[PDB]
Every structure is written in C-alpha cells, then in structure tokens.
Design a protein around this nucleic acid. Structure first.
Lengths: 124, 234, 190
RNA sequence: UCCGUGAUAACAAAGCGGUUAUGUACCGGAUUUUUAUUCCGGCUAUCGGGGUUCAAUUCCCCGUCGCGGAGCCA
RNA sequence: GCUCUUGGUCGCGCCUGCGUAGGAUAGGUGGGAGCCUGGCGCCGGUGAAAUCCACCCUGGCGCGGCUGGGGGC
RNA sequence: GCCAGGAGGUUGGCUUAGAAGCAGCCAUCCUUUAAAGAGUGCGUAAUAGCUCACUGGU
RNA sequence: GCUGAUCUCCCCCGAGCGUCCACAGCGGCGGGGAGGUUUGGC
RNA sequence: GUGCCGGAAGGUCAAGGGGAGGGGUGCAAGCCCCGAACCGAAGCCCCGGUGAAC
RNA sequence: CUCUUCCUAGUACGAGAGGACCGGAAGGG
RNA sequence: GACAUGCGCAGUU
RNA sequence: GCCCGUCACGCCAUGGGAGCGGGCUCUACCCGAAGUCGCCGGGAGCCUACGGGCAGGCGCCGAGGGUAGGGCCCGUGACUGGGGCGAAGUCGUAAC
RNA sequence: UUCCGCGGAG
RNA sequence: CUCCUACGGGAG
C-alpha cells in the first residue's frame, strides 16, 4: 500500500473478542445451576466429565465445568463461575469455583488445595 | 621475441559463443572470430609468470591440468619435464577437495606396484591375476601425474578453465591460487592469474605452456632446449 | 376306358409290376385304414410265396408241404437273435406274446391262418394268394397286381383292390384312380 | 348353444412327424472382504384322456378352462 | 378401349427334402430284379435302402383355365 | 316401683403398646358357697362405678 | 295419543367401607316402583 | 380397460360370384328347387401410438 | 323480595389463630 | 437507585 | 490408504416468521404551570411628594400533558431455514 | 468508622 | 418517588 493510499485508507486496528463473556469484565459471575448432567470427552478421550448448566446473574445460562473427584451440585445449587475453557468438551468455557457458595470443597484432597478450595488439615 | 611468436598463430579463438565478462580481453571480430588483444595479453602474461617465478623459486609445487584432446599430450610432457604434478585423463571429482580420500587410491597404486614384482605371483588364481592387473591398468591410467607430492598444490595452472571449471571450483573453495590459459569462451573473474589466449589450437597451448615450464626451471638451474613439441604438429 | 383296359398295358421283362394306385381320403373323425389280411382275390398269381410258419419243432413235415417253401420252429427264436442280419410271417395265435423275438430286431408281421390240426392240408386255401397294403400317411392305396398274362382276367383289381372299399368313416370321397407300374401308369373310372 | 383358437414343470416360454431348448423363482457348489453380478449344476412338463405313426409338444378325436365371433330361448 | 403389375384357385409341367451310424443334401409308404446303354440291388449296417416305374405328402418355380386386387394412358 | 349384695378362679388369646364384658379376632369353663349372669349395657389407657339377665318385705 | 324398554327420580335388601359402629356420611351384587322431560316402539 | 389416430399381414365377416353334391317332378328331353370347397367390404379381433384424450 | 355494614362482643366456644346464637340499629339493589 | 439518625462526613438498604 | 454428501440421534448459537412487549427519536395540532418580556391599568381597586408605582387584565415564549401519523434499535414467537460440534448408527462412491 | 480535634486516629 | 398527620393539610 503506497503512502498516498495510507494517507487515504490507513491501517485498521484489530480489536479482539472476549474468549469468555462473564459480563462486565468480571473476575467472576454468580448464578444458579439449572441442570447438572454428565457429558462425554471429545476427539480422543473417553470418560464422563461432569458439567453443569448455569443461570447467571446476567439472565445468562451457560455450561460450566466441575473440578476434582466427586462433588455435590443439584438442580438448584447456587454457585460461582470462574471462567476457564475445558478444551476437550465443545462449549464448556467456564469452570465452577470450588468451595464457594453451594459448591463444596474437595474431600480429602491433600495436594494442590488453593485450587479446589480444600481447607488446610492438621497433622497433630 | 615474445610478440612475434604469438602474433605468429596463437591468438583469437572461439567466435560468437563468448562471455561478455571477457570483453576486457579482445581486440575485434574479424570475419566472425574474436581477435583477442595480445597487447593486453602480454601485460597479463607478466603478472602471471611473476607469480609463477615468485613461487618457482620458493620450493612450491604446481598442479597442471588439461583434459581436452587438442591439448592432452603436451600437458603430459611439460609436467614430467618439470616434476610438477598434473592431470591428463579424467579429472576425478573431489581431488583437491577430497584429497585424503582420493589419495587412498594413490596408495592402492603402489599397493599393487609392489605386489607386481614378487614371488606371491607364483600363486593367486587367474581370476585375480586379471582382476588386479586390470584394476591397476586403470588405477595407473588416471594417477600417472597425480601422485608425486602427497600435499595439496600451492596453485594450479590450466588450459580451458570452463572446460575444467569443476577443478577450478574445488581449488577456489579450498583457497588455492588459480592460474590458467583461457580464451574468450570463459569467465575471468574466478581466475586469479589469467593467460588470455586460444585454448584449442595446440599451437598456442604448447607455446604458453612451454615458456611456462622453462620459467619454472629457470628458478632451479638447468636451462636447456625446448621439449618434444612437433611429431605431427600440423 | 369304360371300366378298365387291362390289355392297355402293352416293354421290359415279366411285367408283374402292375398296381392299384388310385388316391384316397384321410380319416373322418376318429379312424384310419387296414387291408383285409390275404384279400381273397380271384387269382393265384402262380407265386411260390415263401410263407413263414411260427411253428415249433413238431410241425416240420407239413408246414413245408402246405404252400410254404420252408418253415422254422423255436430253435431259431433266440438263435437268429445274435445278428442284425440273421433275422411271409405268421404268429402264435391267441394271447401268446410272440412279440419276444418279433418285438425287436420292425418289418411286417401280424395275424395269420389258424389250424391246430396241422400246418398242411387239402383245405389249406388262402395262404399264398393275396396279402395287404394299408394307410401310407401321405396317401395309402398303392396295391399289387398280376403280370402281363391275362385279358379281362387281370380285371381282379376291381371287385378286389377296388372293392377294398369296406373300411372308412365319412369325410370326403375315396377316389382318383390310376393303375400300373415299372413303365408308367394310366387310369380310368373305378 | 354353435365355429374357430390357445394350453407344458412352482411361474415364463419354445422347438410348420424324427427321444428332457431355455429362462425366472427355488435348492445347491466355485469365484467376488461382504452384498449384487458372474460361473457351474439341479430342478415333481409337454393341460387330462383316447387314437394315427417305425417315431408325436407337433396330426387326429373328447373334456376343462381362457379368447374372439355368430346365434339361443322369445 | 389399351398397357403395367401383383394374389387365390383347380389343372398340368420339372424341381423340392442338407437326424446320429453310414459309399452321402435317404421325404412317404408300394412294384422290383435290371433297366441306362454302365448304374446292378441286396451290401456291412440303418427304425427305414438305393437301377428304374408309381401314386403321393412339404415347399418353390414355369406356361395355361376361371375368378380377384392395385398403377398408369 | 323400692331395699340390696350390685360373688370368686373369671383380670383367659391376637393385638397389648390396651381386652382384663364396656378396643376388635378367638372362649365360654370351674366355682366355695344367697347365683351363677358365655358379666347384651355409659365409658376410658387398659383396670377403676351404675344396669338386669337374681329375689325379701311391702 | 297408547306403551314405558331407554330415560330422570326413590325405594327394599345389604355385601362391604367408616378406629369401634346394617345407616354421620357411603352401598356391592340383586329386587320393587313413580313420573311422562330424552331416545325409541305402535 | 375406454376413446381417437396409425397399421395394403393374418382372424372373423353380408349381399353377391361360385358351383362339388342332393331333391321334386315328367316317358322324356327338360322345367324347378335346396346347396359344400373356394373368391367376397366397412365393422370387430389382432398389432402399435396417444393424457391441456375418458 | 333480598344484601350489606355497625353495636351488644372480636364477648360464648376455642390445639386456637378464627368466630356466632338471642336482640337492636343504619345504608343498598 | 432509594435513605433512618447526628453533624457533603459517617452510617443503612 | 484416503475421502464426499444425504439420512438418523444429541448439544449450541443463528436467519425468516401471523405477530406480541419495551427503549430512543421526529413531525403536527389541542390544553398549557411557574416566570421573563410586551401591551393595557378602562366606567372598578392601593399608594402619591400629581410624575408615577403596585394589584389586577390581555398577549408572545413555554416544561409537560393529549391525540395522530413516521423513523431507528432491542427482546420475544407457533413453525420454518439452513450452519457448527459430538469414540465405533444408515445409504451409496463423487474426489486423490 | 455512625472516630478525635483540614489535621490526626480506626 | 418516600414520608407525616389530629385525615383538615403539609414535609423531604
């Protein structure tokens, strides 16, 4: 593109899309679990990943993943959506912040616990 | 003495199938052929032999090459008549560039040259008597002038460069002073000491190659008469 | 002419080659033909017919002297059976299946003369005179006749081969006369 | 009722007097990864009787059924 | 009036007939033992045998009777 | 009408948590002696009072 | 209009349900009537 | 399947042509009668096309 | 012909959670 | 968005 | 070997859609507060130091309100159209 | 933080 | 829009 053209047209700034619309650029968004099923892996995996749809504050309703082993979310459990795609399940673009609201931390996790909201146990 | 000789019948060569680079060395186009400017030729001859001489007096070996028939034989002469290595047959690929490996054969030569005269000849089946004997015929057929010194040349002289540009290349990658008698069907640039002049008419070849070897010897002691040049020279 | 001209048969050899070739008519409804076995005939022809007698090993003295040239018995039943060239012609009357050496190796053979007294006698009439000639598919007729030796005597073809008109249903007209043979043949009203 | 005309095997369809055409559908068996194809082979016949003939799907007769045409009794 | 051309009919006139064995393009039953002026004729086999005379089945050809169609002038 | 004792082993089985007539399902005997009440009957937690199915005097 | 199967109505009996208790309130299977508003018959 | 169009073959087909053969009469020639083959149109059968033909 | 609201009274009764008989007013359709 | 009380500050929803 | 598109099943967004709901705006005319300004202050009132002032009357402007007819955007809608993605379902073989 | 007197404290 | 009231008006 010649200068003159540049003078006319000019370069165009990109502007990218939110890999995750959790509303008002919010660290997190709250909401109720409308449903709690159990989908299946993508391309090369096999298992019963646990997913749950959520009616968000913002009149929104979306699928959120659930971490660790076992849990306790029901058809009407209040929960916190964190925002983390699960590249292996089409759609799932948010994780549920464990150990918050109706979300129960992980029982007996001893390793990484900051993630999974598990309280620091005593060794006595 | 110089001029006359050349002016005799040793200039002007290839016609209309030249190289523009070589346009600095050329007088005109008579009836078709390119008449190389000898005036300049001379000048170059100088710097060339200067080098040769400034080398022939410091114990340096030169390697001559000429794989073309209208210049084979002579080159075979001027070389032996100077102890300077040379190539008259098929200039193997990677000689200079893969010397160590090519040498390996030179060694194989004597390997047989020795088994040639021996009592071990009493045995050995006709299969090998023919195999080896033959394996030597050719062996000896290509290195007859590529043995002498088991060390790379300090330079190399040649007839038609482009004809043997491959050797030239090898030379150039290994950094080795390149000197040669090239005509209009060649590119100077990649030639260090350029002897501009006919590369096919043995007439010019003999001459320029002759006074070259002498000059190689003038710096060694033993100035004599020329070498066998005529035998069927037209 | 008028009736017949037997004398009209006026070259060759003994012209016994005389015949009744008058046409016919196919079978009306469900029927056919059949020549009366040994059709009487007011002639004898002076023939030494080689009448065969389906006798046995007992009738070999009269079966030969009754009007037959030679006669065989049962020692030729399955004896003349080992050749397609080894085998008149009568047949064992009654229900006896003479069709054992006669049912295989095709010629002519059927009903014959009866007499459980002897094959020969002075009352051995009708058994060397006339014979038969039935349906020919294409057109039967084609009968026999004497020879060039008789005037109005040869006129037997009439009340004989012509009076053969006895067996036939009804679906046409049995006619189209023609008499003679081995030379040519004329024809006149029947 | 009367004249003529067709007829075969489960079905389809042949051989204008000289001894099991043939195709389908059906049952095998070969080959094609499978299937379809292809090949090879096998099929409860000559509409039913009775005639003519050395010999008949073939010509003759009688019946049943389909076909087509003319009359029936009034 | 005159031509051209095709049918159906009775005549008559000569052909017509290539199962498997087999002298080989055997039609059918009859007469038959020699006529041609050189084949006999059985052969040995074949369901059936050859020369020649017949009357005839199938189909075709060629003149005639008697009836018919279509084209032209 | 009225006086009166309104007898005792009877408070037996399922369910009892309560049949022990007076939750309901099964019994229906014995009795010392004025008879008898397999005590039909108001209840209550079963029991715990009255009522005649028993009679002196009038 | 006659008739009253059909129909609307109520009645006898009383299984059985109602903690106990044919009947507070229900009523099995079955039976008897009334009325002439339905559908029909003549 | 029906209609219509197309098919110089076949099948069937009325008069008429044709006369095998038979009958009534007469003394007769004759006069009269029935009458098979076969030749015989359109129609129909049969073969085929056809839907902005039913 | 009938309804409503008000005073007796939120009193008799009442695990209650509400709510009268009898009797007397005043508006409506 | 709406504001008790005290003097926009602090505080409530 | 690879590989195409229809079809079936599941999840998601999305177009069309008789329409239905709400937000923003434009135009027009009808009523029209407070208030400024402009007339008047007459046959009525108040004050005067007679000039004049106030009260009150009328008009223009006018927030908004009403009625009407437009424009722009969002939501939602029986059904309908395709599209994306989803280990081993159907039909055939287009392409290398 | 319903703080102490903009300056301080919580 | 919220409040107060002696329901007659007022208040923020």
């Amino acid at each position: 593109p010649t200068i003159n053209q540049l003078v006319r047209k000019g370069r165009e700034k990109v502007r990218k899309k939110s890999k995750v619309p959790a509303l008002k650029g919010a660290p997190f968004r709250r909401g109720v679990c409308t449903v709690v099923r159990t989908v299946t892996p993508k391309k090369p995996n096999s298992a019963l990943r646990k997913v749950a749809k959520v009616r968000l504050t913002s009149g929104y309703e979306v699928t959120a993943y659930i971490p660790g082993e076992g849990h306790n979310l029901q058809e009407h459990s209040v929960v916190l959506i964190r925002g983390g795609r699960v590249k292996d399940l089409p759609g799932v673009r948010y994780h549920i912040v464990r150990g918050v609201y109706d979300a129960a931390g992980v029982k007996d996790r001893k390793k990484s616990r900051s993630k999974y909201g598990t309280k620091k146990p005593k060794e006595a | 003495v110089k001029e006359l000789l050349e002016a005799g019948v040793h200039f002007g060569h290839e016609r209309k199938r030249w190289n523009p680079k070589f346009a600095r060395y050329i007088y005109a186009e008579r009836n078709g052929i390119h008449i190389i400017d000898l005036q300049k030729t001379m000048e170059e001859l100088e710097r060339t032999f200067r080098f040769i001489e400034d080398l022939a007096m410091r114990g340096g070996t030169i390697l001559f090459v000429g794989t073309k028939k209208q210049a084979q034989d002579i080159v075979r002469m001027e070389a032996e008549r100077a102890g300077m290595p040379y190539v008259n047959q098929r200039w193997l690929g990677g000689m200079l560039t893969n010397f160590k490996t090519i040498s390996q054969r030179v060694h194989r030569l004597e390997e047989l040259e020795a088994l040639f005269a021996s009592p071990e000849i009493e045995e050995r089946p006709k299969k090998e008597q023919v195999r080896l004997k033959h394996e030597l015929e050719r062996l000896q057929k290509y290195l007859s002038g590529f043995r002498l010194l088991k060390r790379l040349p300090d330079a190399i002289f040649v007839v038609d460069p482009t004809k043997e540009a491959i050797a030239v290349r090898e030379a150039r990658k290994l950094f080795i002073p390149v000197i040669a008698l090239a005509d209009t069907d060649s590119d100077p640039d990649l030639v260090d000491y350029i002897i501009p002049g006919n590369d096919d008419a043995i007439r010019s070849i003999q001459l320029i190659l002759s006074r070259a070897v002498d000059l190689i010897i003038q710096a060694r002691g033993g100035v004599v008469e020329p070498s066998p040049s005529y035998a069927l020279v037209q | 002419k008028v009736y017949t001209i037997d004398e009209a048969a006026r070259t060759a050899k003994f012209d016994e080659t005389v015949e009744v070739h008058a046409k016919l008519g196919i079978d009306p409804r469900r029927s056919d033909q059949n020549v009366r076995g040994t059709v009487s005939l007011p002639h004898g022809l002076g023939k030494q017919v080689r009448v065969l007698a389906i006798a046995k090993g007992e009738k070999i003295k009269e079966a030969e002297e009754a009007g037959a040239d030679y006669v065989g018995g049962e020692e030729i039943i399955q004896k003349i059976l080992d050749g397609w060239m080894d085998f008149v012609m009568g047949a064992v009357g009654s229900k006896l299946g003479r069709i054992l050496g006669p049912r295989g190796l095709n010629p002519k053979a059927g009903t014959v003369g009866f007499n459980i007294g002897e094959i020969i006698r002075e009352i051995k009439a009708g058994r060397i005179e006339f014979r038969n000639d039935k349906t020919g598919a294409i057109h039967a007729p084609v009968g026999k006749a004497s020879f060039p030796p008789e005037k109005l005597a040869d006129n037997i073809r009439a009340f004989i081969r012509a009076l053969e008109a006895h067996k036939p249903e009804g679906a046409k007209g049995t006619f189209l006369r023609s008499v003679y043979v081995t030379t040519t043949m004329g024809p006149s009203v029947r």
